[PDB]
C-alpha cells in the first residue's frame with residue numbers, strides 16, 4: 070500500500086492550492102481518508118477526514134472553513150482545496166488511512182510554503198580539501214549550497230557512487246531570508262589523487278541541476 | 287525456439303530507447319509476449335505484456351506510463367518504447383513467452399544503463415606472479431576504470447578456461463567499474479607458457495590482449 | 502488536550518517509557534524517523550500492526566497513558582507522537598512530540614576547516630566552514646576567531662540527526678563575511694570545545 | 710505481496726525446500742510458477758501450474774501450493790543447483806505479475822582454507838599515478854572472510870574494495886578479491902606491502918608480502 074501526494078508548492082499569502090493523494094494496494098472506497106499537516110520543526114496537526122464513499126466529513130476550527138476535503142472513490146484519489154491561504158498554513162501535508170480507529174497508512178507528504186518571497190536557485194561552491202585536511206587519513210571535502218528558496222534541496226556525490234561518509238546538513242535559514250546548507254563527505258587521504266569528486270545538487274523548486282567539481286588546492 | 291533482445295545500451299536520464307526482441311522457432315502470432323527486467327543486484331520485476339492480437343496490454347504501475355509495448359506479428363518481433371528513462375530503469379531487460387500461466391521461453395537479456403556518466407574504456411594492467419604457499423601460481427589482469435557495463439575477459443583466446451576466475455564488476459566510489467580476472471596454473475609452467483588476457487569492452491569499442499609475464 | 506514530555510534519553514538495550522497525559526482515553530502512538538513521514542506504532546496496547554517490532558508496547562491507563570520501548574536500538578532515533586480522538590469536538594488531538602536520544606559512549610569530534618572558494622570570492626561574498634564530525638554528545642562549543650578576536654555572531658550552525666550506525670553527531674559552523682570584511686584579516690581559525698577533548702582543538706589557515 | 714527467504718543452504722544428495730509466502734490480508738487462488746537463474750544467465754522455467762515441469766526439468770524439482778503459500782522441493786541436490794530461485798503468479802488485486810524476492814541456494818561443502826595471493830601494483834599503473842594492490846582469496850569455504858591490509862606495517866581502512874565470486878558449480882567454493890586504492894605518492898611512501906587473511910578453515914591468520 071502506497072499513498073503519494075502532489076500539488077504542494079510555494080504560494081503567496083491569500084492564495085489557493087489543490088493537493089491530491091493517490092492510493093494503491095487497498096480499496097479506497099472501503100476506507101476513510103484524512104489529511105494531517107506538520108509545520109517545519111513543529112508537531113503534528115490534524116486537518117480533515119472523510120468517510121467511505123464520502124459519508125462523513127470533518128475539519129478543524131483553526132482553519133475557518135478555508136479547507137475543503139473531497140474524494141473520487143471511483144478514482145482512488147483524495148483532494149484538498151486550500152483557499153485564503155495564510156503564512157501559518159506552511160507545512161508538510163500527509164494523507165492517512167483510517168482502519169481501526171487510527172492512522173495506519175501515511176503518505177510521504179508534500180510541502181506547501183505560503184510566503185511572498187520569490188523562488189531562487191542555489192549557488193554551489195567547493196569546500197576544497199587541501200593541506201588543512203590531515204586527520205590521519207580521514208580527509209574531508211564537500212559543497213556549499215547557498216542562497217536558495219524555497220525548500221528543499223538534494224545533494225549526491227559522484228552520481229550516487231559515493232555514499233559512505235556523506236553528511237548533508239539540515240538547511241539553515243540565513244538572515245537574508247534564503248536557505249543555505251553544506252554536504253560534506255569524509256574519504257581516506259590517499260584517495261585524493263586517484264578520484265574526481267563531484268557534487269550533484271538538485272533544487273527542483275527552481276529547476277536547478279548543478280554538478281560541481283571539487284578539486285583539492 | 288530462440289529469443290534475442292537488442293537495443294540496449296547507455297542513455298542519458300530522461301531519454302528514449304526502443305528495445306526489440308526477435309523470435310525464431312515458434313508461432314509468434316499465437317502467443318502472448320512480455321517484458322521483464324532485473325536490476326543489477328536485485329530481483330526480477332515484470333514490465334509489460336501484450337497478447338497475440340495486440341488487444342490486451344498491461345504495464346506495471348511504477349512505470350507512470352513512460353513505457354509502451356507493441357508487437358509486429360508480420361515480422362515475429364516485439365517492441366518496447368522507453369521514454370523519460372530514470373536511473374531506476376537501469377537493468378537487464380528480457381522478453382518472455384506467456385504459455386499457460388507462466389513465462390515459458392525467455393530471451394538472453396539486453397542491458398540498459400541510464401546514467402549521465404560518459405563511456406570510458408578500461409585500462410588493462412597485468413597482475414604478474416610472485417613468491418607460493420599453494421604450490422600453484424596465480425596470474426591475472428586488472429580491468430580498471432571503465433564504463434558502462436559489461437566487460438568480458440578470456441585467456442589465450444579461450445584456450446585456457448580451467449582455474450579461471452573473473453570477478454564481478456564492483457562500482458567504485460569514482461563512478462567507474464573495475465574487476466580482475468585471475469587464473470591459477472602449475473608453477474612449473476610459468477616460464478614455458480604464454481598467458482594472454484583478452485579483455486573486450488564493446489561499449490567504447492575496446493579490445494586489448496595483454497601478456498602477463500613473471501616480474 | 503494531550504501533553505508529551507519534550508525529551509526522553511535512553512541507553513542501548515535498555516527500556517524507555519514515554520508518557521502522554523490526557524483527560525481520558527484509546528491512545529495511538531506514531532514514530533517520526535529523521536526526515537520521514539510518521540508511521541503507526543500501536544492501535545492500542547499490544548495491538549501493534551504488521552512490521553512494527555514487538556519491542557514497542559503500549560499501556561492502556563485511564564486518563565493518562567504511556568508508551569514503553571524495550572531493547573533500545575539505533576534506529577529508535579525519532580520524535581514519538583501520541584494521538585486520540587476527542588469525540589466531544591469530533592477532532593483528532595496530538596501530542597507535543599518526544600525526541601529520543603540514544604545514549605552512547607563519548608566520542609571525540611573531528612575538526613575540519615574550509616576556506617572560501619575563489620568562485621564565491623569572485624561573487625563578492627566569502628563563506629568559511631568548520632566541520633565537527635561523528636562526536637558525542639551533541640553539546641559542543643565552536644568558536645570563530647578572526648585575528649584572535651571572537652567572531653561568533655556572523656556564524657551559523659547546523660547539526661545532523663543521530664546517526665543510526667554510530668549514534669554520533671555531525672555539526673557544521675559557517676562564517677559568512679563580505680569580500681571587503683574577509684580581505685581585512687589574515688588569521689582565520691576555528692576552535693572547538695567538547696567533552697571528548699582535554700585541550701581545545703583549533704583548525705586555522707591564512708588568507709594566502 | 711509474494712515473499713521469499715533470502716538464502717537457503719542444502720547438502721549434496723539431500724533435499725531442500727524453498728517457500729513463497731503469499732498474502733490475502735491481496736488474495737490467493739492463483740497459480741504460482743517457479744524459475745531458476747544461474748549466475749550470469751537469464752531465468753529458466755522450473756514449475757508451472759500444478760507441479761508441471763517443461764521439457765528439461767528433471768524429476769528432482771516439484772512445486773506445491775497450500776492456501777496463500779507455495780513451496781519448491783529440490784531432492785537430490787547437486788553443486789550445479791547453485792542458483793537464485795524465484796516464484797511468480799498473476800495478482801488480480803493489482804492485475805499485474807508479481808515476483809518473489811528470490812532465494813540464493815547454497816549447497817554446503819567441507820570447510821576449505823583459502824590459498825592467499827598478493828599482487829604488486831603494475832608498472833603501467835604506477836606511471837598513470839595510481840597504485841592498486843590485489844589480495845586474492847582462492848577456493849575457500851564458507852563465504853565469510855576477513856581481509857586486512859598493511860603497508861610497511863601500517864594498517865589501513867576505507868581505501869580498499871573487494872568482490873566475491875559466486876559459488877562454484879563444481880567445487881562449490883568461493884574466490885574473493887580485494888583491491889587497495891593508492892596513488893604513486895602514498896605507494897612510494899613505503900616499499901613493503903602485505904595482506905593478512907583470517908578464515909574459519911585457516912588455523913592462524915596468514916600474511917604475504919613483497920619488497921620493491
Ligand SMILES: CN[C@@H](C)Cc1ccc2c(c1)OCO2
Pocket residue numbers: 318335344384387388389740742797798799806
Ligand atoms: C499478463 N499475462 C499473464 C496472464 C500471464 C502470466 C500469468 C501469471 C504469471 C506469469 C504470466 O508469470 C508468472 O506468473
